[PDB]
Amino acid sequence: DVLTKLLNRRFLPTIFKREIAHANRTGTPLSVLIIDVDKFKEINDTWGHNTGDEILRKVSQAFYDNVRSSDYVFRYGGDEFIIVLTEASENETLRTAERIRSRVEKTKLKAANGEDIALSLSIGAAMFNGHPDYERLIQIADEALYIAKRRGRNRVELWKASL
Numbered sequence: 373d374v375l376t377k378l379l380n381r382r383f384l385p386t387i388f389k390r391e392i393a394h395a396n397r398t399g400t401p402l403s404v405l406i407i408d409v410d411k412f413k414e415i416n417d418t419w420g421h422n423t424g425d426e427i428l429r430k431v432s433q434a435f436y437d438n439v440r441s442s443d444y445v446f447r448y449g450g451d452e453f454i455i456v457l458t459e460a461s462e463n464e465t466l467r468t469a470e471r472i473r474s475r476v477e478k479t480k481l482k483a484a485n486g487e488d489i490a491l492s493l494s495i496g497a498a499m500f501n502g503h504p505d506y507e508r509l510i511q512i513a514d515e516a517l518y519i520a521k522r523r524g525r526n527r528v529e530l531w532k533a534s535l
Contacts, residue, residue, distance in 0.1 A: 409428075435472060477492055
């Protein structure tokens with residue numbers, strides 16, 4: 373089962389604290405992908421939890437197929453995910469986030485009647501800029517996610533001082 377490999381949210385602090393410390397001592401880039409499945413509750417209602425669950429499996433599979441073993445993937449809510457990319461440049465991060473978003477879009481799902489289920493991700497991305505507090509890094513990545521949702525979903529957004 374792919375869903376059992378996912379990390380609980382409670383491990384975010386202890387993991388981020390250590391992973392940030394390492395990124396400052398060495399000067400290696402660090403990035404975060406915050407992901408939320410588009411209109412998931414609406415999908416969960418219409419097609420059922422078995423369908424919602426299978427969606428979470430396909431979506432989780434897309435993650436592990438496009439991250440290293442050295443990266444971390446967390447699942448907090450029903451459709452809420454957090455990916456920590458250790459040692460990934462901005463160029464690499466956006467490329468990774470794009471591979472993930474595209475994969476989910478191009479995964480068509482057959483319904484009970486035989487129709488197609490619309491799948492898409494919204495992804496917020498943010499680069500580590502040296503700040504010691506990890507919550508700041510999650511805040512801006514979540515803010516980036518907020519915009520991707522606000523701008524019509526099925527897209528990636530990178531956090532900037534402009535907003």
